[PDB]
Amino acid sequence: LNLDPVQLTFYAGPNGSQFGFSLDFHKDSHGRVAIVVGAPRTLGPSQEETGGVFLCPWRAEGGQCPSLLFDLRDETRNVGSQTLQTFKARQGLGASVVSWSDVIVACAPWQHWNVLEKTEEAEKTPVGSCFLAQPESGRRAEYSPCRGNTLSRIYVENDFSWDKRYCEAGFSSVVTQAGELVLGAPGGYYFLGLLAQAPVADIFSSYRPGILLWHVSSQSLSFDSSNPEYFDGYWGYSVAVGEFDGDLNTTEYVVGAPTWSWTLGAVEILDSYYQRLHRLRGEQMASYFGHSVAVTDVNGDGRHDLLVGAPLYMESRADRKLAEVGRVYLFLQPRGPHALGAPSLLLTGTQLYGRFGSAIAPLGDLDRDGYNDIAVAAPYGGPSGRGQVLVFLGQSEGLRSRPSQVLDSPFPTGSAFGFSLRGAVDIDDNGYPDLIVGAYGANQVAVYRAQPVVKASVQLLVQDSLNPAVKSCVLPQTKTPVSCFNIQMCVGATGHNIPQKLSLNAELQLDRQKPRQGRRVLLLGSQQAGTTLNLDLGGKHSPICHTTMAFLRDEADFRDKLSPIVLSLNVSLPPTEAGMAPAVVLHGDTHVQEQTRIVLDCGEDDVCVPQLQLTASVTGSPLLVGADNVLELQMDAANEGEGAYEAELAVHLPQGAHYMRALSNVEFERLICNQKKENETRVVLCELGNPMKKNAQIGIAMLVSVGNLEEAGESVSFQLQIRSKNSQNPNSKIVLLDVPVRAEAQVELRGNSFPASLVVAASWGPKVEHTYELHNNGPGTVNGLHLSIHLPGQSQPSDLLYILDIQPQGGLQCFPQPPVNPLKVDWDPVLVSCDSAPCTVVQCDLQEMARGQRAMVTVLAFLWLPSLYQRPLDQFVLQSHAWFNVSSLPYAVPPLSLPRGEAQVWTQLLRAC
Amino acid sequence: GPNICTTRGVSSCQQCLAVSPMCAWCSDEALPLGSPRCDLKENLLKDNCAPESIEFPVSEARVLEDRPLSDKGSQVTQVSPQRIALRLRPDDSKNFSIQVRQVEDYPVDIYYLMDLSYSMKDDLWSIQNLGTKLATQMRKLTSNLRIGFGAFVDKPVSPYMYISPPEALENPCYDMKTTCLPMFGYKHVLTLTDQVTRFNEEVKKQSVSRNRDAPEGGFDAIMQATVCDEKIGWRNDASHLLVFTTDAKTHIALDGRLAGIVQPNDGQCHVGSDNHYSASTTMDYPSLGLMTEKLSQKNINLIFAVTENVVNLYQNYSELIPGTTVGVLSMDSSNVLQLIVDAYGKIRSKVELEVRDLPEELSLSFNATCLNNEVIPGLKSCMGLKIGDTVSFSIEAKVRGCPQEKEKSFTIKPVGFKDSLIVQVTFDCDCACQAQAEPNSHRCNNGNGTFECGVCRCGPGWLGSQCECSEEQDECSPREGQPVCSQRGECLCGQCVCHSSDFGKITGKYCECDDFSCVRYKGEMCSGHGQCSCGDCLCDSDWTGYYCNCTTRTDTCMSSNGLLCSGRGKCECGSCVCIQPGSYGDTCEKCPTCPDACTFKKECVECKKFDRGALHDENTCNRYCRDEIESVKELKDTGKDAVNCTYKNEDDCVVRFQYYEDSSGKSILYVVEEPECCKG
Numbered sequence A: 001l002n003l004d005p006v007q008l009t010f011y012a013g014p015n016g017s018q019f020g021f022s023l024d025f026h027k028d029s030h031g032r033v034a035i036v037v038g039a040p041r042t043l044g045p046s047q048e049e050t051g052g053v054f055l056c057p058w059r060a061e062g063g064q065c066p067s068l069l070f071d072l073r074d075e076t077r078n079v080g081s082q083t084l085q086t087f088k089a090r091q092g093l094g095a096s097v098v099s100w101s102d103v104i105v106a107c108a109p110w111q112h113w114n115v116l117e118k119t120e121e122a123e124k125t126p127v128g129s130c131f132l133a134q135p136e137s138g139r140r141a142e143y144s145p146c147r148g149n150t151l152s153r154i155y156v157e158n159d160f161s162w163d164k165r166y167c168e169a170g171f172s173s174v175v176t177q178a179g180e181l182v183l184g185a186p187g188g189y190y191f192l193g194l195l196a197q198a199p200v201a202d203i204f205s206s207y208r209p210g211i212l213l214w215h216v217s218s219q220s221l222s223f224d225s226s227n228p229e230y231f232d233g234y235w236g237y238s239v240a241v242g243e244f245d246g247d248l249n250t251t252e253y254v255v256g257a258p259t260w261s262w263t264l265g266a267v268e269i270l271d272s273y274y275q276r277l278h279r280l281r282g283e284q285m286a287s288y289f290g291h292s293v294a295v296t297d298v299n300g301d302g303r304h305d306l307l308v309g310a311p312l313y314m315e316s317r318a319d320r321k322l323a324e325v326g327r328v329y330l331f332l333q334p335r336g337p338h339a340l341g342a343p344s345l346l347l348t349g350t351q352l353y354g355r356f357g358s359a360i361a362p363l364g365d366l367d368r369d370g371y372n373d374i375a376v377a378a379p380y381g382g383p384s385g386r387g388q389v390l391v392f393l394g395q396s397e398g399l400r401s402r403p404s405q406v407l408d409s410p411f412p413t414g415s416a417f418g419f420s421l422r423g424a425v426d427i428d429d430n431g432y433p434d435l436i437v438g439a440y441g442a443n444q445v446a447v448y449r450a451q452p453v454v455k456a457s458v459q460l461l462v463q464d465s466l467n468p469a470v471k472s473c474v475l476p477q478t479k480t481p482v483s484c485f486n487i488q489m490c491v492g493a494t495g496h497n498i499p500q501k502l503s504l505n506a507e508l509q510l511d512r513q514k515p516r517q518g519r520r521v522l523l524l525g526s527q528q529a530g531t532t533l534n535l536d537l538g539g540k541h542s543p544i545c546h547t548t549m550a551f552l553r554d555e556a557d558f559r560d561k562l563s564p565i566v567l568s569l570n571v572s573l574p575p576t577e578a579g580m581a582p583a584v585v586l587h588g589d590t591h592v593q594e595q596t597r598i599v600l601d602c603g604e605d606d607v608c609v610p611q612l613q614l615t616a617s618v619t620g621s622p623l624l625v626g627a628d629n630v631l632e633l634q635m636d637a638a639n640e641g642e643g644a645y646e647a648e649l650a651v652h653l654p655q656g657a658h659y660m661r662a663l664s665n666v667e668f669e670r671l672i673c674n675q676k677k678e679n680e681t682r683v684v685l686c687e688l689g690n691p692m693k694k695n696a697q698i699g700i701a702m703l704v705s706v707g708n709l710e711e712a713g714e715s716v717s718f719q720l721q722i723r724s725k726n727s728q729n730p731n732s733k734i735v736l737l738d739v740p741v742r743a744e745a746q747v748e749l750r751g752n753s754f755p756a757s758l759v760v761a762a763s764w765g766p767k768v769e770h771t772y773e774l775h776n777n778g779p780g781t782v783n784g785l786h787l788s789i790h791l792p793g794q795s796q797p798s799d800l801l802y803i804l805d806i807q808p809q810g811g812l813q814c815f816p817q818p819p820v821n822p823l824k825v826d827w828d829p830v831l832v833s834c835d836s837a838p839c840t841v842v843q844c845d846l847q848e849m850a851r852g853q854r855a856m857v858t859v860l861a862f863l864w865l866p867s868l869y870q871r872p873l874d875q876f877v878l879q880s881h882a883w884f885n886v887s888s889l890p891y892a893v894p895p896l897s898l899p900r901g902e903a904q905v906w907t908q909l910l911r912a913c
Numbered sequence B: 001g002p003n004i005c006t007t008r009g010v011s012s013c014q015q016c017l018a019v020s021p022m023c024a025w026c027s028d029e030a031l032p033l034g035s036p037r038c039d040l041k042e043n044l045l046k047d048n049c050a051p052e053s054i055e056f057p058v059s060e061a062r063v064l065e066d067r068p069l070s071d072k073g074s075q076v077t078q079v080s081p082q083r084i085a086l087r088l089r090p091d092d093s094k095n096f097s098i099q100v101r102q103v104e105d106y107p108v109d110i111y112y113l114m115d116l117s118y119s120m121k122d123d124l125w126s127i128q129n130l131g132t133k134l135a136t137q138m139r140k141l142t143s144n145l146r147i148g149f150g151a152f153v154d155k156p157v158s159p160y161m162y163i164s165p166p167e168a169l170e171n172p173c174y175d176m177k178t179t180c181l182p183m184f185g186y187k188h189v190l191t192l193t194d195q196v197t198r199f200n201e202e203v204k205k206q207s208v209s210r211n212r213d214a215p216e217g218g219f220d221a222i223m224q225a226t227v228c229d230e231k232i233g234w235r236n237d238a239s240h241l242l243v244f245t246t247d248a249k250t251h252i253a254l255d256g257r258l259a260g261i262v263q264p265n266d267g268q269c270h271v272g273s274d275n276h277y278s279a280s281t282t283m284d285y286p287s288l289g290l291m292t293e294k295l296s297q298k299n300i301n302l303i304f305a306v307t308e309n310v311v312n313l314y315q316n317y318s319e320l321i322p323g324t325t326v327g328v329l330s331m332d333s334s335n336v337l338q339l340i341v342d343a344y345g346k347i348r349s350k351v352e353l354e355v356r357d358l359p360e361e362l363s364l365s366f367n368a369t370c371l372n373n374e375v376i377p378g379l380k381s382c383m384g385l386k387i388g389d390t391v392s393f394s395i396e397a398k399v400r401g402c403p404q405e406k407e408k409s410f411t412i413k414p415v416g417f418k419d420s421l422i423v424q425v426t427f428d429c430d431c432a433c434q435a436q437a438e439p440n441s442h443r444c445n446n447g448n449g450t451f452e453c454g455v456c457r458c459g460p461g462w463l464g465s466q467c468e469c470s471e472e473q474d475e476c477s478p479r480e481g482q483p484v485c486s487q488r489g490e491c492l493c494g495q496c497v498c499h500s501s502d503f504g505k506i507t508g509k510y511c512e513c514d515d516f517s518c519v520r521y522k523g524e525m526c527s528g529h530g531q532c533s534c535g536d537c538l539c540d541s542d543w544t545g546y547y548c549n550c551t552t553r554t555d556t557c558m559s560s561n562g563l564l565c566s567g568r569g570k571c572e573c574g575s576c577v578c579i580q581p582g583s584y585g586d587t588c589e590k591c592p593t594c595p596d597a598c599t600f601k602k603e604c605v606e607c608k609k610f611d612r613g614a615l616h617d618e619n620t621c622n623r624y625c626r627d628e629i630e631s632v633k634e635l636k637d638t639g640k641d642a643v644n645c646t647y648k649n650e651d652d653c654v655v656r657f658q659y660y661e662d663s664s665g666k667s668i669l670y671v672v673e674e675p676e677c678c679k680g
């Protein structure tokens, strides 16, 4: 919202160096902020690409930066029979950079490495490597945890198990506040992907020049897997850190695997010991869900929220089924140990092939409104395709769906403007965090600075009614009696680090709605319809109030006496001087209108005193927990007193409720309603009349969707009141409605046999299956669901049916009694039912069943021919029966009825020749 | 009587037309002073308005080109009509039909993109004589045919390729006894040629190579195969089959970062005289969307011929990519010959329409008519067809408001075919009497307004029928008790002049109509699928409902089955609402407790054959029942590749049959000929 788009600062690096492929803010011991910039194709000493790292100091003008010196030589060390080799050609140094404390960490993902031993070798592979530097001391160190000394033969014999040869460690990187460097290595374990963690202090102390292969005792890596889902998933393509388990002592990792599960994509949240806490699945194949990850509390409740990028996400369009645009996903972290559910918000790019979501940067609180903000990058976005960076501000419910500010690429085509981003850091010490944007294609870095945000407040106070017959003033100089009245206007201005020399212009307009030469009121001094004031708010913590005096024109000079007289107050910043360059940004309430009117029908005292009455009730009252409720508030508003000016109904909604629509019985059919979230709670205000005349009575019907509120309690409260602008008796009494909340569930049990009918011919008899299914359709979740199936016979040689196998599904576990299939093996109408012969009662259990969730059990069996041909001319009907019930529902107060029911499956047998 | 025309825009001729498509305007100066100038044509005429003075344009769709479709592909036309001059008025729609039809014996091209990594060594041996054997079978389906060959492995760079020892770069099979080719991204081999025998000659000259990771650079190949028109040699008037054989995953865009490649794919051809993809090592793999675009433009039908291990992967790609088909290749590619033949018939089973270069202002709605006259609304595709069959689609084109740009055009086109229907749109919003306007007219108070179409358009300050009063007593409200101009305007000169607003415009005789008070869905007025008019959303051609967020489309509602929502289920807003008790899924495809087809749905020897039962007086006898009634007599497969059963017929005899599924779904009955009865 408040980044300066005009006064930008450009840092540039060597041509073809890809300067700005990665970047980060760096703070020295003395406190000064600088910018670390990575250039992964900078030429090295031997005239070949090895990458490089620059350290730009903060200058408003920008320019060329100095580079940090790093060993770009190849090493060769002979240790016994083995020969260690490092290859820094095209290593891509600076492909990722990250600062912590007074340390900078720059990595070369594609630094190759090989071990030779006589005939054999360990293969020349991109193990990756990171260079650590402490500028002020000049100390250096290296970290490369995927270097091994196992020969190529041993991996083949062990099916390439625990194969770190292709790690490319440093692909992504992040450092914890405790000082723990976490490297992402998507090529690890044969392109499964792995993470390597170690404390920075230990990397420096453990480092020894001339020793290529060593271990940093205190390091820890992720594990390998035999699960096909993870193969070629590039786990660790991106990395981040945060708090997601509740315990502040531990720290949680956030990892991106953008091709996980056959290019479906996935992001996982893990603990310090690399155990999965959550896994967020990609929405669409080949969308690269997990290309970017960011962690910040956007909704301002303390708990970190997760953002995920899928730059290749495709949406549908009239002339394009596969319209690639990119998409960002927002997951708010809830209270307790609840799992991160579906996305709380979806942001989707508009430009084709823009790659919206390839970078996501937490900005901190960019405008200092209380909520943290993010920046999302579209390296090829905008109508030109040159690239864009869109800012999204934090709010009470997460993020705004619309961007507050869009930054177009100042570089030519192909720059990749916004491929790398960093915010959350004040570079010029003005109190507002700033943004740096990489453009490696243009070999440059752009810097945007946050301007101070001035929050304007405006207010306008006037009498509720004007009496022409009362003339207490006289026009200056002359002595012409006039009906005069005061007008007060108050303007304030708040914000952090706003200039001590600040001023605003305040324009006041009387009777704004009337034409220029039809204004019914004027200012007593100038006799004009308006004036502008220059208010000096410089350093004034309080708002400034000034009162003026207006007057109503002669009675015969104007005809309209009914229409209300509108007063407006418009506040703006003065213009900038010759040369331009605006300092601050002005937002908040800069415009406001109030009104007054000529006295009318207020009785002999000429003072309108209303008697506002309100009664209400709710239809469809029992609110179902975990449902999509839609209440209808029915309320009758009436005034048995005198006119109420700017009359309006004010309905205060609870946390779960949302205004849908409103109606009335006048014959005006639909009401002019406006939902105001400005009040501490969500409020809906509908206009009842201006004025609401005497003996006027409006019935109002308002639809309201009470959304999912799992922590609402036994009931939710609605509050309703009619408000007016009058001086005497302005408001009606406060009507409160307590709508009760109770959970309900509806489980359905279905059954059928396969086949239905079964004819028989003259070792095994014909097979028959009886399949039951359960389906929780109702709103509430159900726990402790017990199912009991009754099957005829106990699979005995004397029985008609032989039960082979029972196949339950959906987390359902069953136990038959007596056992089924006592042998080995794979996997008139005679009513043969469990009521007649002995019975095999199968009992099942399900611990929990969500909404829309299902579970089925299939019982397999076949006829026992010897038993069947006892009675060789009978018509049999095989019957089974199933009962079910539920223990409880996991909710606060759900006094309704626990689900129960029964089902029955028949199978008929027929005689054939 | 009173209507939207009269009680709204009674200012100008242009506003009148903008109010509604049914509004006409009368420019006759003789019209009685008072009667509504903007009304229905019938009402203007009933006030004896001069017919030639009546402005009432009607939207139309004049056919420009209408060549009948061809019977034999031996120039061929498969889309009629070819061009249509559409012409619309403000916020108005117009419908028109198009007839797609696949000509019989149309020429075919076949390029063979082959994975040649180490695992496909045995596949080369079984492909040795493909081409001539492929010809022999293809000669039945077409008279003209050309075939070509391609080959690919992956990007020749670490870590995709092995780079040590130095000999490994010369021979990736160094540690193994045999010796294989150096690694290549993609190489063109045989340009589409009529000599089928040369394909066989070239395939024997080919050999495999080796690489590290399981995923491959097939999508790089497919891209180059598509975009390099002149090198591959696709015919303009011919079917384009691209056969893509592979036994493993495929690399997508953004994978190249692991090989230090970030430069995005440009969709350009980079295969020079040496017939190698030169940009393999410098450019990233193509994305799914970018590849799909080129496949569409070049009318290529991509065939995913892949092994079982990786079938579901590529089947899920075919869902996103239109005009494609999957075929289960064996591990030695020994069944590829039949796979292509089956794929061709399958690709030509479907006729799907694609829109191209549609302007933002236009929106389109489709109703499909396939076999029989079963019209299926909200559909632009027909399936279960055979080569030669003909179908038609009813297309409606609505415009939103009135665009500045006077002429626009777009193209409705069948997927994978050159033929298309170009629609030229023209917007008629201006009245004819505007051209004969008269500004600063003597008729409007000595030049205080322009006189066009029998009305004074007054300049700033003045109002009235001739612009009389400036500022200085009539009904500015419906009733006496009701307030003035809905407190949204000023009753100046007996005429409401509405206030301005930050959100939009306030119009109407009493400022009652708004242009920004409509209902929102997700921070979007009319869900961004309709224009707001006096509080009510006027939805576009392909959206319905009070919010304009319920689509008219039923594309996502249909399943591989054939009917919408598999069996039963009402399609609503692109999502099925399953009616069949116990059924669930996206298209109600899943139903464990449904009475098996081999039980209740045995009416195919009841409704049609020996007519009896339900569906006699209702139009749904052979709607569900439309399977292949093959009269085979006791084949050696009694319950294995389907769900067979038997029941007792009318005369107490057994009737044996079978149908269910072989691969994905095959609705083919196998009922016996003669029944077997009993005496008692």
Ligand SMILES: *[C@@H]1O[C@H](CO)[C@@H](O[C@@H]2O[C@H](CO)[C@@H](O[C@@H]3O[C@H](CO)[C@@H](O)[C@H](O[C@H]4O[C@H](CO)[C@@H](O)[C@H](O)[C@@H]4O[C@H]4O[C@H](CO)[C@@H](O)[C@H](O)[C@@H]4O)[C@@H]3O)[C@H](O)[C@H]2NC(C)=O)[C@H](O)[C@H]1NC(C)=O
Binding pocket: A628, A629, A630, A660, A705, B521, B547, B549, B550, B551, B573
């Ligand atoms: C498009 O956007 C709209 C608005 O944002 C979305 O509409 C909401 O849909 C949900 C889910 O269906 C709906 O939830 C309601 O839950 C109630 C629980 O008590 C149900 O009773 C209710 O069913 C009624 O309304 C449905 C929606 O109109 C009807 O389809 C259904 O037949 C029911 O109709 C009864 O009530 C209506 C009152 O309007 C009455 O006229 C009928 O006679 C009948 O008695 C819902 O399922 C929300 O209420 C909907 N929101 C609004 C504002 O209506 C919709 O989901 C979006 N669609 C798409 C495709 O994106």
Ligand SMILES: *[C@@H]1O[C@H](CO)[C@@H](O[C@@H]2O[C@H](CO)[C@@H](O[C@@H]3O[C@H](CO)[C@@H](O)[C@H](O[C@H]4O[C@H](CO)[C@@H](O)[C@H](O)[C@@H]4O)[C@@H]3O)[C@H](O)[C@H]2NC(C)=O)[C@H](O)[C@H]1NC(C)=O
Binding pocket: A261, A262, A264, A285, B312, B313, B314, B316
């Ligand atoms: C090609 O696309 C198809 C269709 O999308 C896809 O098959 C689908 O796979 C998903 C993901 O595995 C399945 O969704 C499941 O839904 C159930 C609840 O209905 C969940 O419980 C599953 O989550 C886990 O739980 C299971 C516990 O038993 C695990 O076994 C499972 O692996 C999950 O970890 C899961 O989300 C969906 O049911 C199928 N749909 C169909 C029709 O098969 C297929 O995998 C894709 N193939 C590719 C990309 O190669």
Ligand SMILES: *[C@@H]1O[C@H](CO)[C@@H](O[C@@H]2O[C@H](CO)[C@@H](O[C@@H]3O[C@H](CO)[C@@H](O)[C@H](O)[C@@H]3O)[C@H](O)[C@H]2NC(C)=O)[C@H](O)[C@H]1NC(C)=O
Binding pocket: B095, B365, B366, B367, B377, B378, B394, B395, B396
């Ligand atoms: C595609 O088919 C659909 C479904 O038939 C068509 O929608 C229908 O269009 C007709 C136009 O004549 C509508 O007719 C109207 O019926 C109502 C009945 O309530 C009647 O009051 C009107 O006078 C009018 O005759 C019909 O309602 C409408 N179906 C709906 C709204 O569900 C559509 O026109 C076809 N589109 C194309 C592009 O072919």
Ligand SMILES: *[C@@H]1O[C@H](CO)[C@@H](O[C@@H]2O[C@H](CO)[C@@H](O)[C@H](O)[C@H]2NC(C)=O)[C@H](O)[C@H]1NC(C)=O
Binding pocket: B095, B096, B394
């Ligand atoms: C689409 O427009 C076509 C114009 O060709 C209409 O076709 C005929 O229209 C006449 C006159 O209204 C009707 O009597 C006929 O029923 C139509 N013919 C046929 C063969 O259907 C047609 O009405 C329009 N259809 C839709 C769905 O909008």
Ligand SMILES: *[C@@H]1O[C@H](CO)[C@@H](O[C@@H]2O[C@H](CO)[C@@H](O)[C@H](O)[C@H]2NC(C)=O)[C@H](O)[C@H]1NC(C)=O
Binding pocket: B445, B446, B447, B448
């Ligand atoms: C529109 O009409 C007004 C009113 O008739 C014109 O005002 C006249 O202005 C002339 C001088 O230009 C005066 O001599 C007359 O006395 C005015 N008329 C009246 C009734 O007071 C005005 O000239 C016209 N406007 C334009 C642009 O031609």
Ligand SMILES: *[C@@H]1O[C@H](CO)[C@@H](O)[C@H](O)[C@H]1NC(C)=O
Binding pocket: A015, A016
């Ligand atoms: C950078 O080098 C490239 C490649 O040689 C060249 O095309 C470009 O013009 C150079 N840019 C500048 C600013 O010298």
Ligand SMILES: *[C@@H]1O[C@H](CO)[C@@H](O)[C@H](O)[C@H]1NC(C)=O
Binding pocket: A505, A506, A507, A532, A570, A571, A572
């Ligand atoms: C207030 O509003 C008017 C028009 O709305 C604008 O032209 C003017 O510049 C504003 N004045 C001030 C002092 O904000």
Ligand SMILES: [Ca+2]
Binding pocket: A243, A244, A245, A246, A247, A248, A249, A250, A251, A252
């Ligand atoms: Ca923790």
Ligand SMILES: [Ca+2]
Binding pocket: A296, A297, A298, A299, A300, A301, A302, A303, A304, A305, A332, A333
């Ligand atoms: Ca949070």
Ligand SMILES: [Ca+2]
Binding pocket: A364, A365, A366, A367, A368, A369, A370, A371, A372, A373, A393, A394
């Ligand atoms: Ca903020």
Ligand SMILES: [Ca+2]
Binding pocket: A425, A426, A427, A428, A429, A430, A431, A432, A433, A434, A449, A450
């Ligand atoms: Ca700053």
Ligand SMILES: [Ca+2]
Binding pocket: A602, A603, A604, A605, A606, A607, A608, A609, A642
């Ligand atoms: Ca009074």
Ligand SMILES: [Ca+2]
Binding pocket: B119, B120, B121, B122, B123, B247, B331, B332, B333
């Ligand atoms: Ca093979």
Ligand SMILES: [Ca+2]
Binding pocket: B153, B154, B160, B211, B212, B213, B214, B215, B216, B217
């Ligand atoms: Ca490979």
Ligand SMILES: [Mg+2]
Binding pocket: B115, B117, B118, B119, B214, B216, B247, B248
């Ligand atoms: Mg392979």
